[PDB]
Amino acid sequence: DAKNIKKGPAPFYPLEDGTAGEQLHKAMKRYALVPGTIAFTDAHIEVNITYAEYFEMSVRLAEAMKRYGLNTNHRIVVCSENSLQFFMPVLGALFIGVAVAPANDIYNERELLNSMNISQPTVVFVSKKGLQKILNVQKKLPIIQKIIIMDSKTDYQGFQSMYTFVTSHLPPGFNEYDFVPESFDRDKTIALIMNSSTGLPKGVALPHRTACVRFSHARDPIFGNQIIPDTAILSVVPFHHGFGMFTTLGYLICGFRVVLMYRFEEELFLRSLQDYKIQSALLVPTLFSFFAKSTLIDKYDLSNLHEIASGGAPLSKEVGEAVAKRFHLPGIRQGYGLTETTSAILITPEGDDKPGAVGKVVPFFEAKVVDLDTGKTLGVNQRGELCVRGPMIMSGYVNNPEATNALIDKDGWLHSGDIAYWDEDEHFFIVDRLKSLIKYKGYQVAPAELESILLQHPNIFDAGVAGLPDDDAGELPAAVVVLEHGKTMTEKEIVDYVASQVTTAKKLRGGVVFVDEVPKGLTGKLDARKIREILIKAKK
Template structure:
């Protein structure tokens, strides 16, 4: 329904259990079914294994006095143990703070000073940085390592999963508004902020995942966990797979051959990807060497996916569906999802249950109707509580009516389907026109000689800004700047042409979730001038 150009998703049903008890019951229900497989070693875990181990971790945390309001950090690449402290935290009502293991010491110190974890579980790769920052903060009491301790001060994770008393009972957690996770925002415009997600936020997403009107995964699906579990997208997806009882094949980093071999050998049915990986599957020659016929559904998130990339992948893999959803760290996972049937190409779907949306004019602030581009603003049970320890940024992102302003430009059509255009702050201003870099990037990567691309605006006295493209060539491709500029001129309207030129580079800098780091592109440009 639309009221003053505010549209709403379906009604939401009441949530009557805590996050910990919900996940506990799912693990009990799925029992001895295989839950996880390590893509590299082949090691497997059943849901019963995960339940037993996570209860042991919960008991160890409980013995240490960790309780509601305390924060448990996890700083690790993907592995089979990652989910155990997550589940354990939720059993006892604690808060989980996933941390990027690739952070520099400076970045990690910034992140932990936001969430203030009492204990951090970390991988071998992250241990040195975690140990360094532990001497600079007073709140971190213990470091638990998934690998080998650097010293006697660190606790080996194996001691957390040994048989315990088996009498541990899940405490009652009745307040669903307590913080369940402090997620680091992507930080594409500065240092990350700590996004506080409540138990209700996450339970609402798990409820959406079980809603037949919005199919994310289903029992029997085999998923590939390639995207980093410390990032909100994959972090929530691992909880959805636990709820659904899906088998997950876990990769700790992207390697082309392992990625393709895992899909082939484990008969992956559903892929959760970012646009750059969709483009890889659609265009890379190596893909033809593998049998990927098991793949039925592809989800793409974190950045807009072009219709062209969607069409290329459908044609190549003959998948049943390629679906885009829309969300951000501040919306827990998604606020729009494609319906099981009748989705529109290039669309991010329709509003999920309980969500309201308004599209606001960038100049006047007025609510806009269908087919008019403006800033997307959302309200609902999936929207974060706020930024941890940052009341100023929290008040800045919410308006007087409680709507979260996303900073993303988009629109909805007459049927309520949403389309994402670009970030407000990333729009290139050319002679009064607003040019979305993501649109130009989508056109560029459809050129047969282009492997990847990123676009920024460069200052121009007469026009304001001119679109400039950074281009990564396909291996062995021969293409010139002039050829790319002419190609684009034939594909886009005059204000979107690459009047700022083309620079050929080895790679496009991106976040772990696949978002282009335009501030780094600007730095690269300065170094070339």
């Protein structure tokens, strides 16, 4: 077919040679040479840290870790809330080819253990508030030999800070500017090990190459940001996640000022947009919903604001438009991306906005929609499973080749598990499963509504509502239910409960199938297709 495969255009900035650490080192060094160039600004404490300070500390950490004994056979974990220190160990490791595994700072000790059990780090960089948890985790992971405090100058509770640690290992006469970052295979050397649906979170190994490709996107006038002097971004998204991770590294390449927030607050956010003359703001999905409700925006001079982005998270046409209207902008930038694709592979092009579209295939990439049955490449405006192929796809899940293979096929295509379609202009649309609708004899009911009702019951922990196909009525509303531990409930009780809450048209006639876990998709949304499958297989 050929024409049925959407390809991203030629990048504005060619993919450059070198490892991610080399490209980062090169970029930051030139910025460091210009005194006063701001790298990060903490909106809460108002402190600015320049590229010179950042470059020098990162280079010192790279050398110190090298001297300590870390190389490509090692991994480090960075567990911290967004801060001015966050990227210091990240850059240092990338400079020497040590894999960085960002651990979610609000992970309870159990999720924390799982993540690090996968990453197996030799050294752990942590913020003061994450120390206790990390120590408890260390007891269970013998590979963790050294803990280093990020947000401290002097030692802290018997542990070295990044500063004292550096001093303990740098050779005499060390020159930050004479330092040369390690050179290595950008394809086999892992840069980041990020945490990902159903089951326990996995480790996504991302080779230096994916970051290198990302750096091209970052400065693309159409798919990223034009490198203009005095560009400031307000990032409230977590650094340990792909959205925050890969947007920031790109910003560092572009020499932008990254204003950060680790705790959301309405007034502080808007005042920051104003005072720091922010051009782009990055928000997590639920914060878009929040701003659609905000009535304080008009009180601030946001003349410089041009972009509000969602990264790899798709947004409903309603929420996007609501937010854009509130901020008096023609639209918002969204895109589709997975941890497994490094960052967004479908992005809203500058000047090429289209209502309801998630965006277009990014340079270096190609995407298609395939038949859920035949697996054959579908055509224009035809809905099927989104598959993508490009140099930013992960190398695989750490120590889980089975899961890798179930996601990435022989031809390099990653099966997203999400349904979408592209139009005559190559704009993609992600089918919102929340808008799916079940039709009982013409009457329509949103699965989300019934789920809201089920989740409302003291005995129900989780629920997934999907339409059990029925020839005599179109569809019968049914649900897979995960009971709260220790509680007992019958299908009848559940059905009767639903009935006492909805119109005779929205009754759970399809019935209930008790499952231990409701099937989720990589997006982090319920998987209607699997729920349907379970319901069918169970009902004779």
